[PDB]
Enzyme design. Structure first.
Site, PDB file in Angstrom:
ATOM      1  N   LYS A 269       0.807  -1.186   0.000  1.00  0.00           N
ATOM      2  CA  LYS A 269       0.000   0.000   0.000  1.00  0.00           C
ATOM      3  C   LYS A 269       0.853   1.254   0.000  1.00  0.00           C
ATOM      4  CE  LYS A 269      -2.968   2.261  -0.768  1.00  0.00           C
ATOM      5  NZ  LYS A 269      -4.248   2.372  -1.496  1.00  0.00           N
TER       6      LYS A 269
ATOM      7  N   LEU B 115       3.357   2.053  -1.160  1.00  0.00           N
ATOM      8  CA  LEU B 115       4.131   2.470  -2.290  1.00  0.00           C
ATOM      9  C   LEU B 115       3.461   3.325  -3.358  1.00  0.00           C
ATOM     10  CD1 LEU B 115       6.035   1.439  -0.785  1.00  0.00           C
ATOM     11  CD2 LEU B 115       6.103  -0.705  -2.083  1.00  0.00           C
TER      12      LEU B 115
ATOM     13  N   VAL C  75       0.976   1.672  -5.694  1.00  0.00           N
ATOM     14  CA  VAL C  75       0.166   0.767  -4.989  1.00  0.00           C
ATOM     15  C   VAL C  75      -0.932   1.343  -4.176  1.00  0.00           C
ATOM     16  CG1 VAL C  75       2.269   0.058  -5.286  1.00  0.00           C
ATOM     17  CG2 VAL C  75       1.407   0.309  -2.996  1.00  0.00           C
TER      18      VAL C  75
ATOM     19  N   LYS D  54      -6.023  -7.182  -3.924  1.00  0.00           N
ATOM     20  CA  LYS D  54      -5.785  -8.403  -4.598  1.00  0.00           C
ATOM     21  C   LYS D  54      -4.564  -9.015  -4.025  1.00  0.00           C
ATOM     22  CE  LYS D  54      -7.580  -5.951  -7.713  1.00  0.00           C
ATOM     23  NZ  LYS D  54      -8.335  -5.418  -8.864  1.00  0.00           N
TER      24      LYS D  54
ATOM     25  N   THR E 153      -3.687 -13.937 -31.242  1.00  0.00           N
ATOM     26  CA  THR E 153      -2.569 -13.086 -31.225  1.00  0.00           C
ATOM     27  C   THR E 153      -1.287 -13.781 -31.668  1.00  0.00           C
ATOM     28  OG1 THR E 153      -3.096 -11.412 -29.496  1.00  0.00           O
ATOM     29  CG2 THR E 153      -1.272 -13.169 -28.931  1.00  0.00           C
TER      30      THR E 153
ATOM     31  N   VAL F  64      -0.754 -15.275 -34.182  1.00  0.00           N
ATOM     32  CA  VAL F  64      -0.569 -15.115 -35.626  1.00  0.00           C
ATOM     33  C   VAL F  64       0.006 -13.801 -36.091  1.00  0.00           C
ATOM     34  CG1 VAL F  64      -1.322 -15.521 -37.939  1.00  0.00           C
ATOM     35  CG2 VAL F  64      -2.175 -16.983 -36.024  1.00  0.00           C
TER      36      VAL F  64
ATOM     37  N   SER G 153      21.526 -12.034 -31.713  1.00  0.00           N
ATOM     38  CA  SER G 153      21.962 -13.192 -30.925  1.00  0.00           C
ATOM     39  C   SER G 153      22.844 -14.158 -31.684  1.00  0.00           C
ATOM     40  CB  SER G 153      20.747 -13.934 -30.363  1.00  0.00           C
ATOM     41  OG  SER G 153      19.701 -14.062 -31.327  1.00  0.00           O
TER      42      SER G 153
ATOM     43  N   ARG H 157      25.688 -12.762 -31.213  1.00  0.00           N
ATOM     44  CA  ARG H 157      26.222 -12.873 -29.848  1.00  0.00           C
ATOM     45  C   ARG H 157      26.693 -14.294 -29.525  1.00  0.00           C
ATOM     46  NH1 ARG H 157      21.112 -10.382 -26.935  1.00  0.00           N
ATOM     47  NH2 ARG H 157      20.487 -12.320 -28.034  1.00  0.00           N
TER      48      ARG H 157
HETATM   49 NA    NA Z   1       0.573 -11.961 -33.861  1.00  0.00          NA
HETATM   50 NA    NA Z   2       1.471   4.434  -1.822  1.00  0.00          NA
END
Ligand code: NA
Ligand code: NA
Length: 327
Positions: free
Chosen positions: A52, A54, A57, A64, A93, A95, A172, A175
């Site tokens: 809280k 924060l 927050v 929750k 999604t 695709v 990569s 890399r």
């Molecule tokens: Na997609």
């Molecule tokens: Na806060």
DNA sequence: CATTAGA
DNA sequence: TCTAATG
């Protein structure tokens, strides 16, 4: 990094659910920061109020939180995990060419299965269609073994057309990495730079070439600077064909390769971390340049680079192999 | 965050 | 134009 694991983890779940399923940019945006603060947070969060305290927050999240602190679950999280309607989206999604906006619409019309999609191949555009076509093939990772064959092949044409070309598979693969997603060949050419008002054929020439020889099989978008497509390694002496790959090629002003080049080869960190280095070494690095820092706050005047070297030399680093661009 | 489709 | 999806 771990102490806050489950919290952060649920938070992102939630978060993602907002953006995707709902068009809840605010909430969506909410969880993320929430998720972000606590990550950075140093203690084992113990309860609502604890959180809280924060920035970000608030009550909603907090709440929750406890329930999660209480039961190793959460409800909303559970429901969403259940709901086909929402699961339906998270699926579409996958695709290429398919997004949330589409995913949702696609759903309302009822398309929900990949099969659904076939059945309405018309309701889809060339992207997604291609996206859908090679659906399986896109999910597979790229073997470094393959990676080089391809590599070899691409260079093969680049040079073939014109020797003046310079292309580089970044990433990569670069890399040392064992596998890749899709290959990225960073293009450029001498006659092209920051000023010399284009030479569109510069791209077009290549693309063509690869199509010629049969490496690129499809186009996803050709612009006069970026092209996105699909390629394939000539399926050897029968019995075993290659999977269909995603490739991307882009033109570059020879006056920004290395830069743009340093950058894409990452890693995602080495960059922030290299980018973080130049700030104190009197500079600035971003996707195309290196600028000498002026004390006024900011400054300009993009410094002249001929190899991945100068940049290190500039802000004054140890040239690091792509191998060692790790973090 | 900038580039390409589309519609 | 605007907006979506890719990166
Ligand atoms: Na997609
Ligand atoms: Na806060």
């Amino acid at each position: 990094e771990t102490l806050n694991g489950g919290i952060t983890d649920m938070l992102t779940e939630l978060a993602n659910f907002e953006k995707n399923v709902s068009q809840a940019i605010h909430k969506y945006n909410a969880y993320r920061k929430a998720a972000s603060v606590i990550a950075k947070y140093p203690h084992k969060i113990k309860s609502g109020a604890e959180a809280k305290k924060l920035p970000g927050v608030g009550t909603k999240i907090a709440e929750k939180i406890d329930e999660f602190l209480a039961t190793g679950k959460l409800r909303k999280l559970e429901k969403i995990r259940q709901d086909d309607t929402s699961s339906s989206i998270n699926f579409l999604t996958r695709v290429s060419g398919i997004g949330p906006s589409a995913a949702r619409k696609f759903v309302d019309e009822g398309i929900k299965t990949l099969e659904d999609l076939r059945k309405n191949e018309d309701k889809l555009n060339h992207h997604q269609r291609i996206g859908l076509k090679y659906f399986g093939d896109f999910e597979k990772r790229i073997p470094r073994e393959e990676m080089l064959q391809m590599q070899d092949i691409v260079l093969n044409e680049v040079k073939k057309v014109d020797s003046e070309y310079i292309a580089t598979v970044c990433g990569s693969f670069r890399r040392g990495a064992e596998s890749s997603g899709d290959m990225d060949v960073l293009l450029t050419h001498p006659s092209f730079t920051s000023e010399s008002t284009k030479q569109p054929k510069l791209l077009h020439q290549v693309v063509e070439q690869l199509q010629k020889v049969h490496f690129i099989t499809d186009t996803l978008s050709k612009g006069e600077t970026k092209f996105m497509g699909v390629c394939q390694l000539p399926s050897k002496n029968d019995e075993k064909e290659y999977p269909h790959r995603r490739i991307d090629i882009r033109l570059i002003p020879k006056d920004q390769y290395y830069c743009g080049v340093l950058y894409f080869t990452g890693s995602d960190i080495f960059n922030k971390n290299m980018r973080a280095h130049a700030l104190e070494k009197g500079f600035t690095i971003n996707e195309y340049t290196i600028r000498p820092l002026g004390v006024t706050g900011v400054a300009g005047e993009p410094l002249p680079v001929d190899s991945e070297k100068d940049i290190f030399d500039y802000i004054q680093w140890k040239y690091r192999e792509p191998k060692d661009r790790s973090e």
